[PDB]
Design a protein around this ligand. Structure first.
Ligand SMILES: Nc1ncnc2c1ncn2[C@@H]1O[C@H](CO)[C@@H](O)[C@H]1O
Length: 486
């Protein structure tokens, strides 16, 4: 039988580890374990950059992952990158595929994508070269393997790709802490399942640290972004400038990228090189060479169209990542494309089967799938319990609704268009998650919860499994990963 995911207790004075299912806690020291952990989490990120909430929700009891789990995650990722990259590069250039009619975006967004296609490859790369930061989330279900036993299966529920940093600094800080504490890598039979240097170095590849960095953020409060800015300040002497949409300016310029100078207002002008400043129309400006985006889709839509094109030439993530890869419907498009992706030699046959096992069944609005769904549920009302309704741009379970209201919702999804200024739903099969023995808080309360996983990609490269959750922002306990030393 394959080694399962499990949470370990690890003695901080000697390193002896034991599964939580089995550990007799009669003489545990959870409170002092918690304080040691929280001190250590201040190493890469000061109290300035942390939310005290999030630093306190961390658990010194890591999740044990196996080398099979790692091979599984890396393989799913390789197939995912290949499929989604091919789809994105084909979005408007393979018209017979009808992608914008199968997954409609807002019209000013589809205008933006079409402008971007006109810039490739001389002003913007082909998409394979600028995929940026993606962070998929996965759930864990059971599957009858051949192996004649139960094996853990990972289903990607969503790809987080409009922001570039969320999750990255938590994994970096947490893996570095349990290492500094000796939980792993210190001779007790455990090693860290993710290298924090690998993760952080991926982030550093999103931008050139030689040039000044701007971070454009509006209504979003931010979490990992402030931990990165803390680490850059204290360890590298890099100080990115946060700017808001209203701070942006354009100046006419022949000899410049896209015939304009993208600028922003400067709030702290005394601390700047006076030779970097422009006094224009009552504004004190500095120029923007590279900008990281932490904006909502509506905020992006609210930019003046020329302002929006000038951001696209200078921004990470690329607008194709933010608008296409982040959208939950793209998981539906990948499933539609599997047979076509093997016909084009984009996926091997087994890679298509890996993807089909790694993405839950997803029905898109305006699809024939959604039509046969409505028919199948009219002939089998018990079916609605097996599915859910996730929003794109608040999940809704079919077992929590009457059959009359369920066919109603589905009947309203027969067009693929988006509600003006809003979105739509996808219909996804409910994943039956495994339950795990866990001790998440220093209270010592053993419970039996599911595990929510995530992993980190930069420019298509798998960087490591991310933190385990059982959202950290809404209070959730979290931890990181170890492997047997064998
Ligand atoms: N396909 C799915 N089946 C069941 N729950 C889901 C699914 N997609 C998202 N979720 C919910 O969203 C959370 C993670 O986004 C899960 O823990 C679960 O509550």
């Amino acid at each position: 039988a394959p080694q399962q995911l499990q949470q370990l207790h690890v003695s901080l004075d000697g390193g002896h580890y034991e599964p939580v299912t089995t550990f007799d806690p009669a003489k545990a020291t959870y409170l002092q374990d918690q304080e040691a952990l929280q001190e250590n989490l201040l190493r890469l990120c000061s109290v300035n950059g942390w939310h005290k909430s999030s630093r306190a929700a961390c658990s010194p009891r890591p999740v044990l992952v196996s080398s099979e789990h790692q091979r599984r995650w890396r393989e799913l990722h390789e197939a995912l990158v290949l499929a989604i990259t091919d789809i994105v590069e084909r979005w408007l250039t393979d018209p017979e595929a009808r992608f914008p009619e199968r997954m409609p975006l807002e019209p000013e967004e589809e205008d933006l994508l079409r402008w971007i296609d006109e810039q490739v490859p001389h002003n913007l790369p082909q998409y394979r070269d600028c995929r940026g930061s993606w962070r998929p989330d996965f759930l864990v279900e059971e599957e009858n393997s051949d192996g004649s036993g139960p094996v853990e299966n990972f289903r990607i529920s969503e790809i987080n790709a409009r922001f570039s940093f969320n999750g990255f600094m938590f994994a970096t800080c947490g893996q570095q802490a349990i290492h500094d504490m000796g939980i792993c890598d210190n001779g007790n039979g455990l090693v860290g399942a993710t290298d924090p240097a690998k993760i952080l170095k991926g982030l550093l590849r999103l931008f050139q640290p030689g040039l000044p960095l701007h971070l454009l953020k509006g209504d979003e409060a931010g979490v990992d972004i402030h931990m990165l800015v803390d680490f850059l300040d204290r360890y590298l002497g890099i100080t990115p400038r946060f700017i808001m949409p209203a701070d942006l300016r354009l100046l006419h310029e022949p000899q410049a990228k896209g015939g304009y100078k993208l600028c922003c207002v400067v709030k702290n002008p005394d601390s700047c090189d006076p030779a970097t400043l422009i006094y224009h129309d009552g504004d004190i400006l500095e120029e923007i060479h590279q900008v990281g985006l932490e904006l909502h889709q509506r905020e992006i839509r609210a930019l003046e169209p020329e302002m929006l094109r000038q951001i696209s030439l200078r921004c990470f993530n690329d607008m194709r990542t933010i608008l296409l890869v982040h959208d939950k419907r793209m998981l539906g498009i990948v499933r539609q494309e599997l047979e076509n992706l093997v016909a084009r030699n984009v996926l091997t046959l087994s890679q298509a089967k890996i993807l089909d096992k790694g993405i839950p069944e997803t029905i898109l609005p305006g699809s024939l799938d959604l039509d046969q769904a409505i028919a199948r549920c009219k002939e089998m009302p018990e079916l609605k319990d097996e599915y859910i309704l996730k929003p794109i741009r608040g999940i809704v379970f079919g077992e929590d609704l009457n059959s009359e209201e369920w066919i109603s919702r589905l009947e309203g999804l027969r067009s693929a268009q988006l509600i003006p200024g809003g979105g739509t739903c996808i219909v996804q099969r409910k994943v039956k998650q495994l339950l795990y023995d866990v001790v998440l808080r220093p209270t010592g309360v053993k419970t039996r919860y599911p595990l929510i996983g995530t992993y980190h990609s930069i420019n298509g490269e798998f960087l490591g499994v991310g933190v385990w959750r059982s959202a950290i922002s809404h209070g959730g306990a979290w931890t990181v990963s170890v492997m047997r030393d064998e």
